[PDB]
């Protein structure tokens, strides 16, 4: 139903009654459309099945949507075409020019023998190639490959400094942006990948792919790796670093120098931060540069536990991870360590225990980032809830030593430990502390800073080797809260700023009520044997106030206190061991209102 | 989380059960709590042969101590009448987190072979042990042999 001799608007008209009237078994004559100028028309969403078209010139079209299955476009023309979407299984399209956007454009099973996509694009969705014959066809880089078949390859090497040669086919680089790097970004031109167009192609090509690999490299400028371009450098670590390409040298070889400096800048620019997740030919290399390096172990510490906990656990790797480790731990600033009494498998036989089911094992061992002689040990779930703020949790949950000596964690600073010694923990301690609004409160209360910055310091850790119960230490402590409490019951002035101040202004009873309790319970650990008071004599001052906050308390919402045995009793205790009580308030409040609690006192106490 | 003090308790036990403690015996814990547990302090020095302790672990374990409460009433200048004690092993100052319960306890009861009045925790028979020693031990063969 065509001669390329009526005009460009006769056979629109011819092509869109087709679509409409679908025979299927319609006649050879029915059918003939060839070498007819269909230049600049529109031809989405028809039916197009089993047309012919071997010889038209669709240049400029527009063939979007349209079905196509059984069409024969042996010799076609498509110079800025559009064919998204479209459908092609099973068409012919033979030695055809296609130089158009082919978005999800469906090629399954088609004949793209001698083809050459010179130059097309697709945005997001690649062109679908399962079953294709590409033998002899020019294939730009970007396009998956996957299921495709290309011939057996006619020439091992290639000549045209423009073409790489995958098995039967040529992919060519004329439109190349003039840059070789363009092409080798799986992460950000993952489109544009001619590292995505090789490395899946079916494993039948793996020989091509080694060739073609070796032969990608000759066009690789280093003079232009200079520029960090991390994504690129990445980017050839994660496809050059698996089989078949572990095997050949003359590759190999080019990579170490290539991906050295690269992994070294990386190990040290993500050092003391969260490391990330990075595919098998990545993470494999970064193992290499620690197995090369034993230094970085230790400057790049957290850094390099991080790595070696990806690597334990990624398959197919999981021995040489396992065994760069056991190398690491030898160190005169680790051994110590590793022999204690609970590390590992706990056999006291100094190595790491692999077999856990649920990651709750102490294997791992970290080094301060400051000469201090400090390293502690924990367990991988332990280590990942103390890198979230909003975790419930206190970041004392392991185990450290200064100087391959165990040491009771309390009696240190948690920002100093975690600001100098390691610095990893430190960003989301000092983030669920912003959070903690405990220190706000304790800055309105007081106001004279000679003591003010006082509290607030010894907040931040649990015991402190800094008392307060001397006959003129009371001295200083009793100047300061005369004014605000009442014997033992709270003056009533206070409660007016009390209930006023940015604090509970605007607070239900229920939640209102809730916060006194907390901050009841804040003083009485102040005045525990653990901190200011002693075992024996305890700052009487702060017990007092103490009293009187979880007093108005019941007086704001008493179905916060719960039980009343309890009242009678908390203060049958904190008026007549201070620490005893402290928990004993604590782990109530955790119970009874947990989400109040985590915001309302020091996440170090918790 | 706490599926973490659970896991280093039960290593804690098998080694008890092979060597043993000669002055703590008879602890039962089911396997599901976990996080508490019962047992005997039997004291072999004087005046305290002629007590069921009840050690009640927490869940953040062990990066807290252990509560070792007496299930029975006591005379002791250092155990409360709620069976309290002020213990320097599982306090807060002391606390490493690599201490074993074959030790907490070797700590507790090697207490009541030789008392202190540093840290008492009743002032009911305090200054008695300080000043009239044969009428705490005259009244403490007592006390054990009634309850």
Same mark, same amino acid.
């Given at each position: ?87 092609? &299984? $099973?068409?012919? @399209? /033979? ?5 158009? #956007?082919?978005?999800?454009? +469906?090629?399954?099973? =088609? %004949? ?56 039967? &086919? $040529?992919?060519? @680089? /004329? ?5 070789? #790097?363009?092409?080798?970004? +799986?992460?950000?031109? =993952? %489109? ?78 993500? %050092? ?335 | ?147």
């Amino acid at each position: 139903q065509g001669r390329a001799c009526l005009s460009k608007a006769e056979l629109t008209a011819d092509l869109i009654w087709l679509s409409a009237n679908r025979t299927g078994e319609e006649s050879a004559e029915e059918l003939n459309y060839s070498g007819c100028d269909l230049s600049g028309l529109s031809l989405v969403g028809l039916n197009l099945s089993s047309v012919n078209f071997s010889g038209a010139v669709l240049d400029d079209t527009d063939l979007r949507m349209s079905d196509l299955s059984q069409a024969v476009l042996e010799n076609c023309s498509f110079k800025n075409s559009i064919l998204n979407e479209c459908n092609f &299984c $099973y068409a012919n @399209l /033979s030695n055809c020019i296609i130089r158009a #956007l082919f978005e999800n454009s +469906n090629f399954s099973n =088609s %004949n793209l023998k001698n083809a050459s996509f010179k130059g097309s694009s697709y945005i997001q969705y690649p062109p679908i190639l399962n079953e294709a014959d590409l033998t002899g066809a020019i294939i730009i880089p970007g396009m998956v490959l996957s299921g495709a078949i290309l011939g057996d390859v006619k020439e091992l090497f290639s000549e045209k400094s423009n073409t790489i040669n995958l098995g039967g &086919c $040529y992919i060519d @680089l /004329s439109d190349i942006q003039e840059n070789i #790097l363009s092409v080798l970004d +799986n992460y950000t031109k =993952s %489109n544009k990948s001619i590292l995505l167009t090789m490395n899946t192609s079916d494993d039948k090509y793996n020989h091509d792919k080694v060739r073609a690999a070796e032969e990608l490299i000759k066009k690789i400028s280093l003079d232009e790796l200079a520029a960090f371009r991390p994504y690129v450098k990445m980017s050839l670590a994660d496809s050059f670093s698996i089989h078949p390409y572990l095997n050949n040298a003359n590759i190999q070889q080019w990579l170490e120098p290539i991906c050295d400096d690269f992994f070294d800048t990386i190990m040290s620019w993500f %050092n003391n931060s969260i490391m990330m997740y990075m595919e098998n030919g990545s993470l494999l290399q970064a193992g290499m540069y620690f197995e090369r390096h034993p230094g970085a172990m230790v400057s790049y510490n957290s850094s390099f536990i991080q790595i070696v906990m990806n690597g334990s656990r990624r398959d197919g790797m999981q021995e040489r991870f396992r065994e760069l480790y056991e190398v690491y731990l030898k160190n005169e600033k680790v051994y110590p360590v590793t022999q204690q009494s609970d590390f590992g498998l706990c056999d006291g036989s100094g190595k790491p225990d692999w077999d856990d089911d649920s990651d709750l094992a102490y294997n791992w061992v970290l080094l301060s980032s400051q000469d201090d002689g400090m390293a502690m040990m924990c367990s991988l779930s332990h280590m990942v809830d103390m890198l979230s703020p909003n975790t419930s949790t206190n970041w004392m949950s392991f185990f450290l030593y200064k100087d391959g000596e165990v040491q009771n964690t309390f009696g240190y600073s948690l920002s100093n430990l975690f600001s100098e010694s390691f610095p990893i923990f430190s960003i989301p301690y000092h983030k669920a502390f912003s959070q903690n609004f405990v220190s706000g409160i304790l800055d309105i209360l007081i106001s004279d800073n000679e003591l003010k910055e006082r509290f607030i310091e010894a907040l931040n850790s649990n015991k402190s080797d800094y008392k307060m119960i001397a006959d003129d230490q009371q001295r200083k402590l009793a100047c300061v809260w005369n004014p605000f409490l009442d014997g033992w019951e709270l003056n009533a002035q206070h409660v007016d700023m009390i209930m006023g101040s940015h604090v509970l202004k605007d607070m239900p009873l229920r939640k209102q009520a809730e916060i006194l309790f907390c901050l009841g319970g804040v003083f009485c650990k102040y005045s525990s044997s653990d901190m200011f008071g002693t075992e024996y004599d305890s700052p009487e001052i702060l017990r007092r106030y103490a009293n009187g906050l979880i007093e108005q308390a019941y007086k704001t919402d008493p179905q916060v206190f719960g039980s009343v045995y309890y009242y009678n009793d908390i203060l049958d205790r904190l008026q007549g061991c201070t620490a005893v009580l402290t928990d004993m308030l604590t782990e109530h409040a955790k119970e009874s209102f947990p989400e109040i609690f985590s915001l309302y006192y020091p996440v170090a106490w918790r | 989380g706490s599926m973490a003090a659970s896991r280093r308790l039960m290593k804690e036990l098998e080694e008890i059960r092979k060597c043993g403690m000669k002055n703590f015996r008879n602890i039962q814990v089911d396997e599901a709590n976990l996080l508490t547990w019962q047992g005997l302090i039997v004291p072999d020095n004087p005046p305290y042969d002629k007590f069921r302790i009840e050690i009640n672990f927490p869940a953040e374990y062990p990066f807290k101590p252990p509560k070792i409460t007496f299930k029975t009433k006591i005379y002791h200048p250092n155990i409360d009448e709620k069976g309290q004690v002020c213990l320097p092993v599982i306090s807060a100052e002391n606390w490493k987190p690599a201490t074993k319960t074959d030790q907490v306890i070797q700590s507790l009861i090697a207490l009541v072979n030789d008392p202190q009045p540093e840290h008492p925790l009743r002032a009911d028979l305090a200054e008695e042990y300080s000043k009239d020693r044969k009428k705490f031990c005259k009244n403490a063969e007592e006390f054990t042999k009634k309850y």
